[PDB]
Amino acid sequence: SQQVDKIKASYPLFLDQDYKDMLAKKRDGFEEKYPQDKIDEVFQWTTTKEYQELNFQREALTVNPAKACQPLGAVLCALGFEKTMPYVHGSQGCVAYFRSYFNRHFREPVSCVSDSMTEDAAVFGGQQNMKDGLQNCKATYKPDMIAVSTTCMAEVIGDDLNAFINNSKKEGFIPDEFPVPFAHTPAFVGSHVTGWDNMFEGIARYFTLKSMDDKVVGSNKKINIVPGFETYLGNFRVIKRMLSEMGVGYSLLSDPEEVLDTPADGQFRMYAGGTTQEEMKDAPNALNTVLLQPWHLEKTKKFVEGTWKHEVPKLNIPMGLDWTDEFLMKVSEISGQPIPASLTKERGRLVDMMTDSHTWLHGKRFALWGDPDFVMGLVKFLLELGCEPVHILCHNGNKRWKKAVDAILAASPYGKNATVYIGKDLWHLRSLVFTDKPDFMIGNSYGKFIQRDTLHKGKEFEVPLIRIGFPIFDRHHLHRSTTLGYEGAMQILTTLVNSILERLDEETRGMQATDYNHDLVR
Amino acid sequence: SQQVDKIKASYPLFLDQDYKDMLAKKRDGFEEKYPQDKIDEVFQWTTTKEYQELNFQREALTVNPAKACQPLGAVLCALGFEKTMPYVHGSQGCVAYFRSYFNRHFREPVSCVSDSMTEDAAVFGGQQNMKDGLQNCKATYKPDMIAVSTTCMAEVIGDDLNAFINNSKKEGFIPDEFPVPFAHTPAFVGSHVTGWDNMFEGIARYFTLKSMDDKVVGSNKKINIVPGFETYLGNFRVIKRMLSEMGVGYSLLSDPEEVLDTPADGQFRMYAGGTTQEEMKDAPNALNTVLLQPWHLEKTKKFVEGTWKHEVPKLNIPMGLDWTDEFLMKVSEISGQPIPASLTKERGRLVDMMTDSHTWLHGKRFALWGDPDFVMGLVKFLLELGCEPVHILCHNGNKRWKKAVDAILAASPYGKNATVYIGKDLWHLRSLVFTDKPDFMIGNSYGKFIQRDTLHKGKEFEVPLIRIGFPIFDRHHLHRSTTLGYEGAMQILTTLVNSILERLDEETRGMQATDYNHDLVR
Amino acid sequence: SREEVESLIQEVLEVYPEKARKDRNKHLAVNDPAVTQSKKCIISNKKSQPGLMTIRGCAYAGSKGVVWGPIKDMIHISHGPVGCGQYSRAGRRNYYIGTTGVNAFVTMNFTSDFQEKDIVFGGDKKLAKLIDEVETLFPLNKGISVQSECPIGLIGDDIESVSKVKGAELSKTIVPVRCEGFRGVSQSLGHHIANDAVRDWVLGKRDEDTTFASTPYDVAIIGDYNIGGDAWSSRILLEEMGLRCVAQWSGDGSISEIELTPKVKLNLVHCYRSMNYISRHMEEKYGIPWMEYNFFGPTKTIESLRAIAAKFDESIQKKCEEVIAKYKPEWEAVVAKYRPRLEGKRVMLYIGGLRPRHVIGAYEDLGMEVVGTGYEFAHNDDYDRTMKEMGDSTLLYDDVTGYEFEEFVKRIKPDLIGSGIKEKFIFQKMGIPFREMHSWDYSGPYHGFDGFAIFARDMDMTLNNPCWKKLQAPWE
Amino acid sequence: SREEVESLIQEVLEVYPEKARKDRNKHLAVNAVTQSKKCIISNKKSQPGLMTIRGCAYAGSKGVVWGPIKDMIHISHGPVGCGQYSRAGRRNYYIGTTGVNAFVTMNFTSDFQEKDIVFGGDKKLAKLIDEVETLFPLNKGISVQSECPIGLIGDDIESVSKVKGAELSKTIVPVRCEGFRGVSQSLGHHIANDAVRDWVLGKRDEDTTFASTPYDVAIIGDYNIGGDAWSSRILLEEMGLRCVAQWSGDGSISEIELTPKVKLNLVHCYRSMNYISRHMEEKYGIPWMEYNFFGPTKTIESLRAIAAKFDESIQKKCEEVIAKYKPEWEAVVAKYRPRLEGKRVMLYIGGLRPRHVIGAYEDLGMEVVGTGYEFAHNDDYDRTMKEMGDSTLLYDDVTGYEFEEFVKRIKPDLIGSGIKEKFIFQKMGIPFREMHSWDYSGPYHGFDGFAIFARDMDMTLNNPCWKKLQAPWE
Numbered sequence A, B: 001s002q003q004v005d006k007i008k009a010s011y012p013l014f015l016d017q018d019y020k021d022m023l024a025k026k027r028d029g030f031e032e033k034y035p036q037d038k039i040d041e042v043f044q045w046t047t048t049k050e051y052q053e054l055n056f057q058r059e060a061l062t063v064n065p066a067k068a069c070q071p072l073g074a075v076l077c078a079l080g081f082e083k084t085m086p087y088v089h090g091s092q093g094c095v096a097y098f099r100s101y102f103n104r105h106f107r108e109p110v111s112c113v114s115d116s117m118t119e120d121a122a123v124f125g126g127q128q129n130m131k132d133g134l135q136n137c138k139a140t141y142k143p144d145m146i147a148v149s150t151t152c153m154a155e156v157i158g159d160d161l162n163a164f165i166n167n168s169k170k171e172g173f174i175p176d177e178f179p180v181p182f183a184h185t186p187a188f189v190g191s192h193v194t195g196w197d198n199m200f201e202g203i204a205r206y207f208t209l210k211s212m213d214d215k216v217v218g219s220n221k222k223i224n225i226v227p228g229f230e231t232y233l234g235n236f237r238v239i240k241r242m243l244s245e246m247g248v249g250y251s252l253l254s255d256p257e258e259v260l261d262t263p264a265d266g267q268f269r270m271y272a273g274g275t276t277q278e279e280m281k282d283a284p285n286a287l288n289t290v291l292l293q294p295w296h297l298e299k300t301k302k303f304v305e306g307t308w309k310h311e312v313p314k315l316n317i318p319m320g321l322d323w324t325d326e327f328l329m330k331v332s333e334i335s336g337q338p339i340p341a342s343l344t345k346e347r348g349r350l351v352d353m354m355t356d357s358h359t360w361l362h363g364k365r366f367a368l369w370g371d372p373d374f375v376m377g378l379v380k381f382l383l384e385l386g387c388e389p390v391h392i393l394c395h396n397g398n399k400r401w402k403k404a405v406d407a408i409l410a411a412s413p414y415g416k417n418a419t420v421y422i423g424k425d426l427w428h429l430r431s432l433v434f435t436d437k438p439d440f441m442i443g444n445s446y447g448k449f450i451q452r453d454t455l456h457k458g459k460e461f462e463v464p465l466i467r468i469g470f471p472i473f474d475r476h477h478l479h480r481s482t483t484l485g486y487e488g489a490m491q492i493l494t495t496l497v498n499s500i501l502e503r504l505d506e507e508t509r510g511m512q513a514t515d516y517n518h519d520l521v522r
Numbered sequence C: 001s002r003e004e005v006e007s008l009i010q011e012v013l014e015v016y017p018e019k020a021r022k023d024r025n026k027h028l029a030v031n032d033p034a035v036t037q038s039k040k041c042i043i044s045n046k047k048s049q050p051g052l053m054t055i056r057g058c059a060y061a062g063s064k065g066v067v068w069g070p071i072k073d074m075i076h077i078s079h080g081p082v083g084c085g086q087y088s089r090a091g092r093r094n095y096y097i098g099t100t101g102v103n104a105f106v107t108m109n110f111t112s113d114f115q116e117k118d119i120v121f122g123g124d125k126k127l128a129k130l131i132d133e134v135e136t137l138f139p140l141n142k143g144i145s146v147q148s149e150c151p152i153g154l155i156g157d158d159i160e161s162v163s164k165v166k167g168a169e170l171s172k173t174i175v176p177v178r179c180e181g182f183r184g185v186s187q188s189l190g191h192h193i194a195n196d197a198v199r200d201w202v203l204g205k206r207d208e209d210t211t212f213a214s215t216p217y218d219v220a221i222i223g224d225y226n227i228g229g230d231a232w233s234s235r236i237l238l239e240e241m242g243l244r245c246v247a248q249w250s251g252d253g254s255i256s257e258i259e260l261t262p263k264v265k266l267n268l269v270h271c272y273r274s275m276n277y278i279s280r281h282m283e284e285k286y287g288i289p290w291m292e293y294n295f296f297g298p299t300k301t302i303e304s305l306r307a308i309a310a311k312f313d314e315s316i317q318k319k320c321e322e323v324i325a326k327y328k329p330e331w332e333a334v335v336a337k338y339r340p341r342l343e344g345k346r347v348m349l350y351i352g353g354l355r356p357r358h359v360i361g362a363y364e365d366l367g368m369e370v371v372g373t374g375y376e377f378a379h380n381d382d383y384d385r386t387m388k389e390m391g392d393s394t395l396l397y398d399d400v401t402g403y404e405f406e407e408f409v410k411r412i413k414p415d416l417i418g419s420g421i422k423e424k425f426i427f428q429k430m431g432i433p434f435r436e437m438h439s440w441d442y443s444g445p446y447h448g449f450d451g452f453a454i455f456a457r458d459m460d461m462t463l464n465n466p467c468w469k470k471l472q473a474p475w476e
Numbered sequence D: 001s002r003e004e005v006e007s008l009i010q011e012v013l014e015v016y017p018e019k020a021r022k023d024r025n026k027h028l029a030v031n032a033v034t035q036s037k038k039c040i041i042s043n044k045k046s047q048p049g050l051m052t053i054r055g056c057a058y059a060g061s062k063g064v065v066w067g068p069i070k071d072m073i074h075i076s077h078g079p080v081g082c083g084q085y086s087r088a089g090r091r092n093y094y095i096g097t098t099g100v101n102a103f104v105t106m107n108f109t110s111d112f113q114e115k116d117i118v119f120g121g122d123k124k125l126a127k128l129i130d131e132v133e134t135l136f137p138l139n140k141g142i143s144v145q146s147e148c149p150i151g152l153i154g155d156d157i158e159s160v161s162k163v164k165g166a167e168l169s170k171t172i173v174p175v176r177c178e179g180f181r182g183v184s185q186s187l188g189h190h191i192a193n194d195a196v197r198d199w200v201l202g203k204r205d206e207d208t209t210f211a212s213t214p215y216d217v218a219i220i221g222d223y224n225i226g227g228d229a230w231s232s233r234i235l236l237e238e239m240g241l242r243c244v245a246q247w248s249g250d251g252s253i254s255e256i257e258l259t260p261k262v263k264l265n266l267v268h269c270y271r272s273m274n275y276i277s278r279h280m281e282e283k284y285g286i287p288w289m290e291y292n293f294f295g296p297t298k299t300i301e302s303l304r305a306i307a308a309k310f311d312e313s314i315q316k317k318c319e320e321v322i323a324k325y326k327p328e329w330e331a332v333v334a335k336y337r338p339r340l341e342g343k344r345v346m347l348y349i350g351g352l353r354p355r356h357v358i359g360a361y362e363d364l365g366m367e368v369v370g371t372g373y374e375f376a377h378n379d380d381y382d383r384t385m386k387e388m389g390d391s392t393l394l395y396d397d398v399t400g401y402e403f404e405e406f407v408k409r410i411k412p413d414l415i416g417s418g419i420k421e422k423f424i425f426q427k428m429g430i431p432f433r434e435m436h437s438w439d440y441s442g443p444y445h446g447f448d449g450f451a452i453f454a455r456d457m458d459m460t461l462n463n464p465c466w467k468k469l470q471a472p473w474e
Ligand code: ICS
Pocket: C062, C066, C092, C187, C225, C227, C271, C273, C274, C351, C352, C353, C354, C355, C356, C437, C438, C439
């Protein structure tokens, strides 16, 4: 039933008595469900010392991964170029998934096409898809560039992207001078960040490799900035903001901030902003190239050093205090620009917030996950804050990365109780927050089901989720936030300290029971 | 007892069994406390309509006010001028309170002095306190200006601020040319916002009134901006940012953004930034003067129109979409500058966020409080978002203000179930959220004790607090936020929709009970 | 204006290369009451032209996403690389009652996470290992399905041998499903492949069963996936009418419920497209008849309640009128409040395989007019039915392209658009109210009388929202 | 040291005009100092315009003494400023149902407007008393905390209290704690102690109902900051004593009214509560002693001194308590003293802590190089001389400029003071702990409190943030 003035959605409609009895009768009549006490026994078993050991014996089964597949990152990389249409050579279902994945995180349109390779293309290759695909896409959506990647179907059957695009130009489906950069992105290799790296290198390949004879390193007196897989609008904007403040000529290579944030003013803009093709052609003339997230830009690095002849600085992701300091000092050395009073003051304000908030942050234990560069920057900042990154999980990390992070934990007393896990997933992490319970989780929206599980064992055991990372689907407009630089460190600090205080307020809300500690001032 | 590796603070230490029994024996032995069931009976009574009717018959008793006294605002106004020392002529206890009040909201030093008027000033006035006070302060803390207000003791005994300062200069305690503006700020008139108005008018008086002959309106082609009582750093910064983007010459009169946010870089800065004495001297030469919070700047208004001959525009506080539009359109007309593409795009981005989040905001009911201008701007924005500001309380509002807000509610179908309360306090509001329960509260930190009360009746009846306003003592660094302009509307929108969704997640976290609606994507 | 819709159709086709122009011309039609052939107004269930940005999905989404995923007490293995299981993780709101991770597993993502080494040597040995690890860590699962992603067939693996060997080894139901994304043209073939996998590996498990106590009023809900509780709000009404719902497929469905479906007296098919296959098989093998029904809006629900009841005896028909009379004032209150707020407004739809026609009556119950609908993967029997639901001279579009859908909106200028997540923010930026008709915009349910109140409330809040008045800056 | 402090003292004073320089010379001392009278003056007027940290007599009555009494409603009589700025600012912890039977963190006020200045607030107060009784029926007494204007305008709150008290058979306590009375919160303590004596303490002098035991005791001058008194009574009762009452921390009016029954008054805060303690000795014969529950050394010394005032059973249980907590606080020092040893601290607090916490710092191997009070008296400074070391710096009612300048030359590793000082020195790169509100931590009393105190001093002194005050590029 419904009362017209007060409509009930699924919650709490199905808590009505008649819906509750019906759901009880459906279960007892036809579901053959394990008795509740058998369910409770097993749930308790799944939280134990025992279950975790078996859980970490897994070799074949993955449960609740913390990574996506390559072509997802190739799409995001392609969206950062001017009037560029990302184009995934393979099956259509992938593209609908890529688009929907980014639609929900950015709450924005995401334009991307497939060439609809079918069962028949598996037997004789997808070259006809490529020729008609390029021609249709160019004619219908009018892009200045089409950046081509692959689904796993195209990879396994061996479609040669290079030959296929060349034949599409040969037989006149697209003009010969029309830019069609490409990159193979097998979903069974690496993860979504690898697809970003492969795509960017392919695009850098296209506009540069054959034109090096006229290139002089540093002639454009600029610094190239490669952001990598990045899903916070504020991270693109804070990097450009700091460089402009320093008066440093720069070129952001792949910059999707405009297309991922168009205004609602009565018209739909398929393309907006992005790195121009000329900025790509002129990149070799830069003083140097800075990789913002080097641990998933390895191939790009080799090309920037091998072909552009740039000596890429060894810089960590600009997260936290020390690593933003190092980023700014290295930019100052390359560009000759001094760090201005404006950025030195912003630094002191971040340190000020650390001094005012250290009494509530000190010793707080965290479980966290994400991409390799995002994770280690979060690790470093938590140490600078006096926190303990107890569980550090990176599903798509490698051994070299884990060693660099282990070295960081060793240089601080707050890394004493910390362990770095690679190749493990969120079901592994579920065990850790039960066995070695932390105070909070820092992770994406998938982590909400882990807090779900912890609360079921008991309120005392609940581990609240702090949403930082990708993807964040159950909150609105957090994709606008910043995690890099001092500004991003200021946002992370405030979120962390206030999550602690909101949880303290919750635990001291009980009148006459615990509200003696329900202080107005904290 | 304590475990060395896990020290317990007051919470949860006092939940230990031995402390629980001790507290039980203290109560049963010597407290002569009312029986628990009598406490429950009275609590339930205090939530009823009956009680509310009695609560609203109050004429003498105020309980849990939502306002401060005048000199508090006079201090904040004075801190916004360059190297200015706020100076409150009267008793010293007030100043310790003013400073501590602002210390805890801004988590920053607050410089303010008193002239320690004692019982003996009751009989012979505080003139010796003024002469020695000015001389000591000027000599010790090296201010460029001393801005004088009054405590209520000085007001009741009738100290002539004008004569006292003039004689202090005559007999050589301070230099004759040393700037000493003053303003009477009786705590028994108006509220803290009135003290801001009184102080600013006194300072404008000081630097202009005797010099109007050489003044030509518009000769410096600037616009004067009076912010009023303002405790969000981002509100000062967003106004200056939008005008600079517009290329509009402006003078922010009273700007404490620098001194309320100095960097921790090894030295303490007593003064930082602020409106210069010249900007005040030259203010009459501006094209016009815009009052950002006009409903507590009437005295200032009359002086700017009566003496500077400026035609102050009829503008609401720039909060929300329509009023930021009107603010920008009026600035464009006065200055001749067009609204730039950057601000037109930022507007479209705010509208985009409204379209993405309207399904969760629609119909949501709010009880809110604060200063008059902040409240009506919050009301206006909530109506633009499809939400219903059911309980609108302004303890220091007046009848004309209530009429302007009532007219606003009448021009929108979302103000239909709304009532505006003036002269009522937070004990009144507690009753309203029980008898006419909304979904959330938007208010300052005092509102936390109302949510406490609501939860005690039942989880079904809990009204969560959304912290916007002054003072915010139980969270860290929210004073860095913005509430004005499109940027502030973007922050408020995000805060509101995510408070709604965080509460939905809490209510759908129970496994097998309500987590069928615990959606990953919202 | 039939002439103007047909000139609008040609105009939008003028952008395409000729091969795309000749194909798309056959999937864009203007409905005409003098014709319900479908085989003469429009073609469907064809290739998606390459490079035109189809809204379509794959056969994996049609099997794992749509039919198999919702089955709550089984664990479903996304067999292949990391992508498919992750992009599909808890994306569809197939609501269920259960203890997730212990006895229920819908919202989780089990996958073999193919590495290159599984491409080289094959994933059959990894799959057997994974089945054992599933059995160790999740002992209370009542079955396992293996949802084949793209590379499984490509490399030549045999999930069927693994399933039979491991199934026998553990005496457990293990369902191999050949739903690789390259098979077919859309999610549709995933429905068919999944229906056959159900038939072959699950449905017949209790053919020799003689314990199930049968009643004359036993029924099953076929093709309701409980989006936001759609099937729960449909079951309340059937059981108030006196029927006993033995099973629901797949929304909040258990494997035992599926296995008991051969026992029922009547199969109630909501989604014809995804579930007509298994319904025909149960009529041929067990003799159980099946009928289609519609629980969208009060008009269709009442028509459905009376048609279902007519298939039984007078007692059920009597209770049918009791249910109708009980909810009569409730849905009348909903219409009295919201229809004045929505009457005369025009709606354009584009969804999957049923809803594009099924929700029309509900819009009309609030007095709105569907000026355009379309499907991503419908067949000509879906379009035959759409022709009796749609009005004269309205525009129909099959597997519409993003460019086509944009252009069509620009000319027709509907007051509301109902479609999917990839379309929502395009038209919201154009200033046209949008409601998601897949996930119900995280609202719902929309089925039954209780759902009509939410559906009506949702259409009102968005179409009449103040935000739509503010798209143009006052100085522009 | 010695000459190095004395020259720092004169060096900083050269900025003042001579009248302020001459006065402030008398309030700055370096530690035959058995007699305060003789090396520093205290409890005088503050110099105008020098930014004193002091408060008022209202803060001394409503803020510290009366406010914490949980089952009474305390009326801030006057304008809105005083009740609002002190609302829930002091963490005088209590058990109760706020708004129903307890009212500590609420703000009751008459909200003086100009009409009340003109015509007087005596009629408004009587009407307010009635409104309190209808809406808060379970209050067991009312106090009227006068703010500045009450005495200046010529009100008579004693008559209101006497008239209304009889009509309603209710305890109504007039407190004339107007902010201009005195030079600080000190007189508010004195005014509040006398208001207790005159209007509350004598209500059960002829009532010999309460069954007394030889071990009945009262905690005088513990306001339960973060639970300080709870962490103290547990030790006294484990020793076998019965704490009849705590004043005013989690204290009830009935508890206060039963204090004349006890055998011994245990005074923690001498400054704020010595007045009523001497009075109960004169009228009821109850002796009183001072004690210290800051750190294990002082707590043990206090437990054994308190126990010595009873019989062998209490002295025996004293050693049992000491032996129980011995391994606990030994683990705390073993963990934290290595991390704090040799570090130097400067303090500045109200009227007791500046001397009361020295032993706790030394239990962690720290050295208090400077302490001072806002509103202490010469008997507080006499007691300070024994606790402080040779050549340390003493300062009475210090100016913000003085306190900054002193820190700049001494360079302590930690500063212990209040909220108005915290963010000054944090920006200077010096670790700071609030020694008023315990920085929202605590308790710090007793053995359970020493663990928190040590953890708090460690977490702040050794925090990584302090090494980042200087940008690597300057
Ligand atoms: S199954 Fe089909 S696309 Fe019939 S694949 Fe799709 S939950 Fe749609 S129009 Mo998403 S044939 Fe169901 C559908 Fe309809 S996922 Fe849902 S809304 S009624």
